[PDB]
Paper text:
The degradation machinery of the UPS, the 26 s proteasome, is composed of a hydrolytic barrel-like 20 s core and regulators, such as 19 s or 11 s, on either or both ends of the 20 s. The 20 s core that is constitutively expressed in most cells (c-20S) is a stack of 4 rings of 14 α and 14 β subunits organized in a α1–7β1–7β1–7α1–7 fashion, where 2 copies of each caspase-like β1, trypsin-like β2 and chymotrypsin-like β5 active subunit are located in the inner β rings. I-20S is expressed in cells of the immune system and other cells exposed to cytokines that are elevated during immune responses, where the active subunits β1c, β2c, and β5c in c-20S are replaced by β1i, β2i and β5i, respectively. The i-20S serves diverse functions in the immune system, including the provision of oligopeptides for antigen presentation, T cell differentiation and proliferation.
To identify the binding site of the compound, we used high-resolution cryo-electron microscopy and single-particle analysis to determine the structure of the human immunoproteasome in complex with PKS21004 (See Experimental methods). The final cryo-EM 3D map had a resolution of 3.8 Å in which the secondary structures such as β-strands and α-helices were very well resolved. We were able to unambiguously assign the density in the substrate-binding cleft near the active site of β5i to PKS21004. No additional densities were observed in the active site of any other β-subunits or in any of the α− subunits. This result is consistent with the conclusion that PKS21004 specifically inhibits the activity of the β5 subunits. PKS21004 is largely hydrophobic and interacted with β5i and β6 primarily via hydrophobic contacts. The inhibitor also formed two hydrogen bonds, one between the R3 group and Ser27 of β5i, and the other between R3 and Asp125 of β6. However, among the human β5i residues interacting with PKS21004, many are different from their corresponding residues in the human β5c. The side chain of Met45 is swung outward as compared to the apo human β5c or β5c in complex with CFZ to accommodate the bulky R1 group in β5i. Kinetic analysis indicated that PKS21004 inhibits β5i and β5c noncompetitively with substrate.
Numbering used by the authors:
A (entry chain O): 2 to 241
B (entry chain F): 1 to 199
C (entry chain R): 2 to 186, 191 to 245
D (entry chain N): 2 to 233
E (entry chain P): 3 to 232
F (entry chain M): 9 to 241
G (entry chain L): 4 to 237
H (entry chain Q): 6 to 244
The structure:
């Protein structure tokens, strides 16, 4: 019996959780995903891997899920685990809306989930979720927000970041090309198509190889919108 | 409700009236109060008809598992021990009464009484609300060593008496004779109930 | 591939590099431990199951060394392989029949019985702690609708309908001969079963060395043919 | 449930999982504290400047109550768990005693918790060392260090995280009653300490401040850099 | 009591090796094919039938889940029976709770979840089946493919099991968006017919159709008719 | 790899042997029993001047008459100390009397072989306590010092040295101890042996000292008292 | 090497190595010898002293008015199983209002120690007991072992070097039904002293004697108490 | 190897733990029973391992119920545990069904119980065989022999332990269908004195029992006079 236990909740001889870092390898092989935090809105841009075949595209997007009235999340890596995490986040935020009669801020939601991923990473011996998540959501305390969480349960707020394939080149291009507090929504669109153009080595970028959904404010209500294909071709053509 | 059983040499005879009344208006004027628990073990229901039915069904289930697992017909003593256990374990929740009767290779005909969760073999084990009106008749007309026709006409007479006096009992009188050959289900229509002093 | 093996694939029910389950396949190697061979075939009127019966010790009470097991008043059963596992599936199958009768108010059809039992062997072929019950249970029963029924469930969870079959060491030659006869067409049926089995064994059986079960349309109750009647069919075989 | 014994002795008497967790702390972002006359300062190294980064949500210096705050280092998620449990337990203490928790109470609590997960079924030890600083109701300053092994201590000023050897050497050399006579000498003590280990001292490992009977006070990054030029 | 730790652990490369292997098992399964027409969906799967002894009408691979949903698989049979009973359970819970036929995207979400739960739970292997769920409602066709890893893809037309690569390349050149249902069935049966190896009959290939009238299996007579003209 | 409940080829649990080796790394503590009461002195082994000396408390109170010295995994002994405290106080509540030392060391000694990895209804203890305690106290039977170890065996001892240098020191205990010894002689003697064994130069900071006398409750000697006793060196 | 890690692994020879290694524990324990006469059931224990200053660990444990034990091996296991035995006897004198017969007691202990000897991840009790008990059937001396087996003995000696004591007890077992109390205890002390190294000697310290019989509830005699019984022994 | 737990078939399909446990039964001392016209008899080659043990130590003839006897072998503690399980079985059957349990159903239940431990790595097989005897006016004498695998077979003559083969060759010398208990007892005695390898493992006891007509179906150990006349005759047949 003890021969069979993989012991997924133990440290190494140098203090590195092998399952969490191997998971970071898996998400390391996932499709790149990046969003940017701006003043007038927030956009997410994810390389799709449903590229192109006899797929049907029955859904509105691939890696963008809607979490409450006021938030959106992008996963990367293990698709199924991303499903479980999304369902769990919806359950959390709706329990907060039951128990407080207001939307849940992004920080509280991310912490509630990241306590879960940490919980698997610590005991129970289950494998950790190999699914990194980028969040976007508005709240009346702190404004537009971007939260990156990873399999280890650690998370942080960012102004624009990229997770997945070529994440290093993506964050590099953001460091070279992000104007803090001065990026507009359209400036964010242009930069995002810049980074995704340079990173995605499959080679000529199409409207089919990515999707982008943007969140802004409109009349005391938050709008979570995905970009139609015409706008994507328009913005890539503009990028040319 | 007036169910009755009798023990004779080759087997038994389980008479029973065929009315179930709701208060003062009847709900069912034909209802077989003899549901088989096995091929040759009938239980005469009474009291809470729903409760009696649930007990007959659960008892039939256990008696069938125990029946097949031994690969031999379950003795009536077994059956009245399972219906006795299920009638005793729930006695605060079931107003049931099940004069379980039958046949078996090892003992021949039997009629066990199981009111309130007890177990007592008896020659004739009458029950039901109408049974409180025929103790006189059965005591005056029961002689041990009854041939089968004597048992059948006997219980028909007795339940006839109970039906004439009791309001909780009316309709037809079912009779089954359980022996080594098998069960012989019979019915007594209201035009055939032997007439007694009517005034 | 081609017999490749990695880690604990050869120890528990997990997929080897090829995709096989070595524990289930070994279990099929385990039905050959009993050293027996059983057969069931069905004609339009009845379904007959004939088996070996090896009583070597002479102290064995021959009344209890039997692979026929009355499952209900209408459902036959012939085990094969390891013995005690066969006993256990007989108890579980009997419990299934009594429970179907209690909850659903009628005799469990053979298809739903053998389906259910196959569902209870699959659970062994998926969980990692318990092994698969090494015993291929064959059933025979007369449904009022489809008629004579013979279904074979094995440690792999499979099961199917059969116009004939065989289980045990000589399943190969048995099924070969039954091919050679079904392609050449059932009233006697029993003559077919004993002819096939005695052929693949080449024994010229004696009336005590085997057993026979029959469930006929005219007689739903599963029943066992004694050594006298099996003597009748055998002697009816020798005299042609 | 998973009930394997993860933490078990080895053939020297060592608990290898504990030594490994302390390994994880030794790669944590270096933190330091000091205990002054009426002030208690904590410094958390830099951690991850990353110009796109958000400052507020990547700090290591959370509040445990009105009078109890804590740094840490190592597996930051785990420390988020311990911080959470300690907060709920502080409030349960105010429910059952009406008195705010002494620093000894909450620290000995968390030390108990870390000790339990060092010694239970299917649970790895926490990879966090927490330097909980706070003020007893009498107002005395309090520094308690808690490591994954669960053993805790009072401290004058102790450093945790990577390179805590050299920094602890620093406070061994420079902690004097002249050093903590005033506020600014105290804070220039802390930042003067980490500056041996904080790349480009000035605006990296910003800090935190708590005054007697005053809620936690935090930088003030520009004010970190004033001290930066003041020491560099 | 049973093993509580996951048996599927991230290999040092980070790709879940058990799901690679399980996908190899489905890759060896009997070939299946599904194509979505404009008004419905076809399901046709190859019977890897051994000896003629088999009562072929005894069990079917294309089982209905409600009046409007189907299933075909590729790989391990008994595992498939598990997922079928689970799916019937789920659609029935949905029908009790909301009083509506379960939309197929939903059912594939839940059954995809159940296929995921065993890539992570204690001491269970992942499934070894790749489902094809075809469904009709809102006047629209649906065809999803769930894998052992739990993820589900929405497809126009697909193929799985033995030789699924040549199957998919066969569909890329032969699927057109305006294909009516019967000509769809013709295209699928041709697709299997590319690598059948055994001279298909109305006994050894199954055909399922889901249209506005609901889902059902085509009796071997009708399937024999479609096996005409080929 | 093997379990926690495995017996070696010699007949001892592995985890109790490796644990009793783990106690060998702890700081040496020593206490001595006399007809006047029992004393307890333990080396703190301060690691850095930045530490608070009053932080390391290896001689803690279990009740008004039972002082519990320890040595080894100081973290583990917290569950033992709290166990004993809850025990003696529940004993006082129920039975309205102080609890004997043998009763306490026996109770708290029941949680030493209570470890496993398959029964585990809670997440119960997954390894033996890496603690060697020395419950000292006085009752109606008078002064008594009960050793205890990870293996759960609690034994009455006249005077015992436990920890890193406990062997040599124990040789000093059999060398110096005699039944008619007076308690101040006990304090002086034990401090002499610790001064023999300690690596660092002895002082009144990196040790502690407690005693429990027939009329005196448990008491920890402060700095000045320790210095006054170390004036004899 | 690959069979000696678990209790639930049958060797190729059909033995459970962990159980045998468990009996090695009682074989290392300090020697304790019991025996019985027509009327008395005597125990005799050498209380090991770890250090010269340390006191000899107790080997005898009151179980009830008529039953006493003598452990040898893992002590904490001994107090666990002793707590179980005590709970049994108290429950019997509670419900049935009569002292538990001894043989039923050692049967309960047998089924108790048998459970972990067959379930994975448990370990056999490494405590080997002698139980003395008087009831209506006369005095009793049961031996129990890590294998959960129990014995009914005329006189048995467990502990390190116990084989000598069992040798002597074979030399003189035929006399034990007739011996009075004192002569009996003399036999026990002699056979127990057969185990120790030659130079070292029985004293009032390292010996304990718990006697129980017809007219006597079970009673344990400590260091000064064995004086009367601890005399002569040439 | 491939033999580290029962839940692991070898490449040839043999749960090595059950076979090993059978090798544990085969190292123990042989016990035999013989069903005959009117009941069943049991002998027990109960090797006494030292002169210290009481006459009657380590009995291997139990009483799982008043109409059923039980002779065991092998690792004896496991035999006791089967005693508790079986006793709970017959008790449960008398409380459920109100009469003495048919022995056949009792060896079904117990056989499923032993079999319950050859499927999991979490537990090991019972390393012990045993025989059950019973007599009743309704079914006569019956003898079932569970082994570590859990399989239940009815025997006219049985033998379990180390000298099983020689005891079988001895049992086949009998017309046990045509003998009564009081004559069976002698022959079982002769069997145990013959099969016992004397020069190796000397000093056993003979511990007999029957259940049948003369005991009114009540399983009880043999009278000492009958056991001693039996040993006398069997030893005389050795000569």
């Amino acid at each position: 019996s003890r021969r069979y236990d993989s012991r997924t909740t133990i440290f190494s001889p140098e203090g590195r959780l092998y399952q969490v870092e191997y998971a970071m390898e898996a998400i390391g092989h996932a499709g790149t995903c990046l969003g940017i935090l701006a003043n007038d809105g927030v956009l997410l841009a994810a390389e799709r891997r449903n590229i192109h075949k006899l797929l049907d595209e029955v859904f509105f997007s691939e890696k963008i899920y809607k979490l409450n009235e006021d938030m959106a999340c992008s996963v990367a890596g293990i698709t199924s685990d991303a499903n479980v995490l999304t369902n769990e986040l919806r359950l959390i935020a709706q329990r907060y809306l039951l128990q407080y009669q207001e939307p849940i801020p992004c920080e509280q939601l991310v912490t509630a989930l990241c306590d879960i991923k940490q919980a698997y990473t610590q005991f129970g011996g289950k494998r950790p979720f190999g699914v990194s998540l980028l969040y976007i959501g508005w709240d009346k305390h702190y404004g537009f927000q971007l939260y990156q969480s990873d399999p280890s349960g650690n998370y942080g707020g960012w102004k624009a970041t990229c997770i997945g394939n070529n994440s290093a080149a993506a964050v590099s291009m953001l460091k070279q090309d992000y104007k803090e507090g001065e990026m507009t929504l359209k400036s964010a669109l242009a930069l995002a198509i810049k980074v995704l153009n340079k990173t995605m080595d499959v080679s000529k970028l199409s409207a089919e190889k990515v999707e982008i959904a943007t969140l802004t404010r409109e009349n005391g209500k938050t709008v979570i919108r995905v970009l139609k294909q015409k706008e994507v071709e328009q913005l890539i053509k503009k990028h040319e | 409700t007036t169910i009755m059983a009798v023990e004779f040499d080759g087997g038994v005879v389980m008479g029973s009236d065929s009315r179930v009344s709701a208060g003062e208006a009847v709900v069912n004027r034909v209802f077989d109060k003899l549901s088989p628990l096995h091929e040759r073990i009938y239980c005469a229901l009474s009291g809470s008809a729903a409760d009696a039915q649930a007990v007959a069904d659960m008892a039939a289930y256990q008696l069938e598992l125990h029946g097949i697992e031994l690969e031999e017909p379950p003795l009536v003593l077994a059956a009245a021990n399972v219906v006795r256990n299920i009638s005793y374990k729930y006695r605060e929740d079931l107003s049931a009464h099940l004069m379980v009767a039958g046949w078996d290779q090892r003992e021949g005909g039997q009629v066990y009484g199981t009111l309130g969760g007890m177990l007592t073999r008896q020659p004739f084990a009458i029950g039901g609300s109408g049974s409180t009106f025929i103790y006189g008749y059965v005591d005056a007309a029961y002689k041990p060593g009854m041939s089968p026709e004597e048992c059948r006409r006997f219980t028909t007479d007795a339940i006839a008496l109970a039906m004439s006096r009791d309001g909780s009992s009316g309709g037809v009188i079912y009779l089954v004779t359980i022996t080594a050959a098998g069960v012989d289900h019979r019915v007594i229509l209201g035009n055939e109930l032997p007439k007694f002093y009517d005034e | 591939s081609r017999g490749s093996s990695a880690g604990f694939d050869r120890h528990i029910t997990i997929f080897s590099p090829e995709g096989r389950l070595y524990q289930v396949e070994y279990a099929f190697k385990a039905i050959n431990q009993g050293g027996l061979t059983s057969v069931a075939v069905r004609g339009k009127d009845c379904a007959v199951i004939v088996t070996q019966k090896k009583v070597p010790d002479k102290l064995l009470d021959s009344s209890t060394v039997t692979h026929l097991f009355k499952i209900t008043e209408n459902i036959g059963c012939v085990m094969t392989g390891m013995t005690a596992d066969s006993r256990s599936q007989v108890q579980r199958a009997r419990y299934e029949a009594a429970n179907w009768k209690y909850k659903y108010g009628y005799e469990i059809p053979v298809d739903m019985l053998c389906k259910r039992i196959a569902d209870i062997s699959q659970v062994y072929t998926q969980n990692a702690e318990m092994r698969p019950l090494g015993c291929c249970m064959i059933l025979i029963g007369i449904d009022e609708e489809q008629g004579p029924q013979v279904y074979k469930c094995d440690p792999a969870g499979y099961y199917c309908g059969f116009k004939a079959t065989a289980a045990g060491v000589k399943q190969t030659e048995s099924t070969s001969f039954l091919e050679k006869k079904v392609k050449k067409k059932f009233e006697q049926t029993v003559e077919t079963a004993i002819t096939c089995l005695s052929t693949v064994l080449s024994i010229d059986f004696k009336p005590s060395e085997i057993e026979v079960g029959v469930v006929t349309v005219e007689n739903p109750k599963f029943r066992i043919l004694t050594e006298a009647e099996i003597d009748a069919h055998l002697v009816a075989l020798a005299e042609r | 449930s998973y009930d394997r014994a993860i933490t078990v002795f080895s053939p020297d008497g060592h608990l290898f999982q504990v030594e490994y967790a302390q390994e994880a702390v030794k790669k944590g972002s270096t933190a330091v504290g000091v205990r002054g006359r009426d002030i208690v300062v904590l410094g958390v190294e830099k951690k991850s400047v990353a110009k796109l980064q958000d400052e507020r949500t990547v700090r290591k210096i959370c509040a445990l109550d009105d009078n109890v705050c804590m740094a840490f280092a190592g597996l930051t998620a785990d420390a988020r768990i311990v911080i959470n449990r300690a907060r709920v337990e502080c409030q349960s203490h105010r429910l059952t005693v009406e008195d705010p928790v002494t620093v000894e109470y909450i620290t000995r609590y968390i030390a108990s918790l870390k000790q339990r997960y060092t010694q239970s079924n299917g649970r790895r030890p926490f990879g966090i060392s927490a330097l909980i600083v706070g003020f007893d109701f009498d107002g005395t300053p309090r520094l308690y260090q808690t490591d994954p092994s669960g053993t805790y201590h009072a401290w004058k000023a102790n450093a945790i995280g990577r390179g805590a050897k050299s920094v602890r050497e620093f406070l061994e050399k420079n902690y004097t009653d002249e050093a903590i006579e005033t506020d600014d000498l105290t804070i220039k003590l802390v930042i003067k300490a980490l500056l041996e280990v904080v790349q480009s001292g000035g605006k990296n490992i910003e800090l935190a401040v708590m005054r007697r009977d005053q809620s936690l006070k935090i930088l003030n990054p520009e004010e970190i850099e004033k001290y930066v030029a003041e020491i560099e | 009591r049973g093993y509580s730790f996951s048996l599927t652990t991230f290999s040092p490369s980070g790709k879940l090796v058990q799901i690679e292997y399980a996908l190899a098992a489905v890759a060896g399964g009997a070939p299946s094919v599904g194509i979505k027409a404009a008004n419905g969906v076809v399901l046709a799967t190859e019977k890897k039938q051994k000896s003629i002894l088999y009562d072929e009408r005894s069990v079917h691979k294309v089982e209905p889940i409600t009046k409007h949903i189907g299933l075909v698989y590729s790989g391990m049979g008994p595992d498939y029976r598990v997922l079928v009973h689970r799916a019937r359970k789920l659609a029935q819970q949905y029908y009790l709770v909301y009083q509506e036929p379960i939309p197929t995207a939903q059912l594939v979400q839940r059954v995809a979840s159940v296929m995921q739960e065993y890539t992570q739970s204690g001491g269970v292997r992942p499934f070894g089946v790749s489902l094809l769920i075809c469904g009709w409602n809102e006047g629209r066709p649906y065809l999803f493919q769930s894998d052992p890893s739990g993820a589900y893809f929405a497809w126009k037309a697909t193929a799985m099991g033995k030789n699924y690569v040549n199957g998919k390349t066969f569909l890329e050149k032969r699927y057109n968006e305006d294909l009516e249902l019967e000509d769809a069935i013709h295209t699928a049966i041709l697709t299997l017919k590319e690598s059948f190896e055994g001279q298909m009959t109305e006994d050894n290939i199954e055909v399922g159709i889901c249209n506005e009238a609901g889902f059902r299996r085509l009796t071997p007579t009708e399937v024999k008719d479609y096996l005409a003209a080929i | 790899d093997r379990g926690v409940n495995t017996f070696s080829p010699e007949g001892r649990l592995f985890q109790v042997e490796y644990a009793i080796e783990a106690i060998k790394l702890g700081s040496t503590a020593i206490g001595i029993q006399t007809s006047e009461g029992v004393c307890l002195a333990v080396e703190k082994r301060i690691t850095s001047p930045l530490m608070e000396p009053s932080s390391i408390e290896k001689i803690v109170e279990i009740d008004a008459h039972i002082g519990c010295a320890m040595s080894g995994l100081i973290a583990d002994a917290k569950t033992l100390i709290d166990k004993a405290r809850v025990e003696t106080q529940n004993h006082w509540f129920t039975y309205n009397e102080t609890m004997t030392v043998e009763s306490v060391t026996q109770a708290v000694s029941n949680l030493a072989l209570q470890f496993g990895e398959e029964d585990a209804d809670p997440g119960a203890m997954s390894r033996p306590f890496g603690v060697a305690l020395l419950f000292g106290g006085v009752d109606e039977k008078g002064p008594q010092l009960f050793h205890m170890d990870p293996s759960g065996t609690f034994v009455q001892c006249d005077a015992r040295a436990i920890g890193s240098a406990s062997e040599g020191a124990q040789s000093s205990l059999q060398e110096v101890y005699h039944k008619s010894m007076t308690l101040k002689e006990a304090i002086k003697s034990s401090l002499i042996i610790l001064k023999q064994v300690m690596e660092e130069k002895l002082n009144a900071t990196n040790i502690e000292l407690a005693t429990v006398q027939p009329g005196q409750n448990f008491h920890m000697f402060t700095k000045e008292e320790l210095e006054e006793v170390i004036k004899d060196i | 090497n690959q069979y000696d890690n678990d209790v639930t692994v049958w060797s190729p020879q059909g033995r459970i190595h962990q159980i045998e290694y468990a009996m090695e524990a009682v074989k290392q324990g300090s020697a304790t010898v019991g025996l019985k006469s027509k009327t008395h059931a005597v125990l005799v224990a050498l209380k090991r002293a770890q250090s010269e200053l340390a006191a000899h660990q107790k080997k005898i444990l009151h179980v009830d008015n008529h039953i006493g034990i003598s452990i040898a091996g893992l002590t904490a296991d001994a107090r666990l199983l002793c707590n179980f035995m005590r709970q049994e006897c108290l429950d019997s004198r509670f419900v049935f209002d009569r002292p538990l017969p001894v043989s039923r007691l050692v049967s309960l202990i047998g089924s108790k120690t048998q459970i972990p000897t067959q379930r994975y991840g448990r370990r056999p009790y490494g405590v080997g007991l002698l139980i003395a008990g008087y009831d209506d059937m006369g005095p009793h001396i049961f031996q129990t072992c890590p294998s959960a087996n129990y014995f009914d003995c005329r006189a048995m000696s467990i502990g390190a070097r116990s084989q000598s004591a069992r040798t002597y007890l074979e030399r003189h077992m035929s006399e034990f039904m007739e011996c009075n109390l004192n002569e009996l205890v003399k036999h026990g002390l002699r056979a127990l002293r057969e185990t120790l190294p030659a130079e070292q000697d029985l004293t009032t310290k390292n010996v304990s004697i718990g006697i129980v019989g017809k007219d006597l509830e079970f009673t344990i005699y400590d260091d000064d108490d064995v004086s009367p019984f601890l005399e002569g022994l040439e | 190897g491939y033999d580290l737990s029962a839940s692991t078939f070898s490449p040839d399909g043999r749960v090595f733990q059950v076979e090993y446990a059978m090798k544990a039964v085969e190292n123990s001392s042989t016990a035999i029973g013989i069903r005959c016209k009117d009941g069943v008899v049991f002998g027990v080659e109960k090797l006494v391992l030292s002169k210290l043990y009481e006459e009657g130590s380590n009995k291997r003839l139990f009483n799982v119920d008043r109409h059923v006897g039980m002779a065991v072998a092998g690792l004896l503690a496991d035999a006791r545990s089967l005693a508790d399980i079986a006793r709970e079985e017959a008790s449960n059957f008398r409380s459920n069904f109100g009469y003495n349990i048919p022995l056949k159903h009792l060896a079904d239940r117990v056989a499923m119980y032993v079999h319950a431990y050859t499927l999991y790595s979490a537990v090991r097989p019972f390393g012990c065989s045993f025989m059950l005897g019973s007599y009743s006016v309704n079914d006569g004498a019956q003898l079932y022999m569970i082994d570590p695998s859990g399989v239940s077979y009815g025997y006219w003559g049985c033998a379990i332990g180390k000298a099983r083969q020689a005891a079988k060759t001895e049992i086949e010398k009998l017309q046990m269908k045509e003998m009564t208990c009081r004559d069976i007892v002698k022959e079982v005695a002769k069997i145990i004195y013959i099969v016992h390898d004397e020069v190796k493992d000397k000093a056993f006891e003979l511990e007999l029992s029957w259940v049948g007509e003369l005991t009114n179906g009540r399983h009880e150990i043999v009278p000492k006079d009958i056991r001693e006349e039996a040993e006398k005759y069997a030893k005389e047949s050795l000569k």
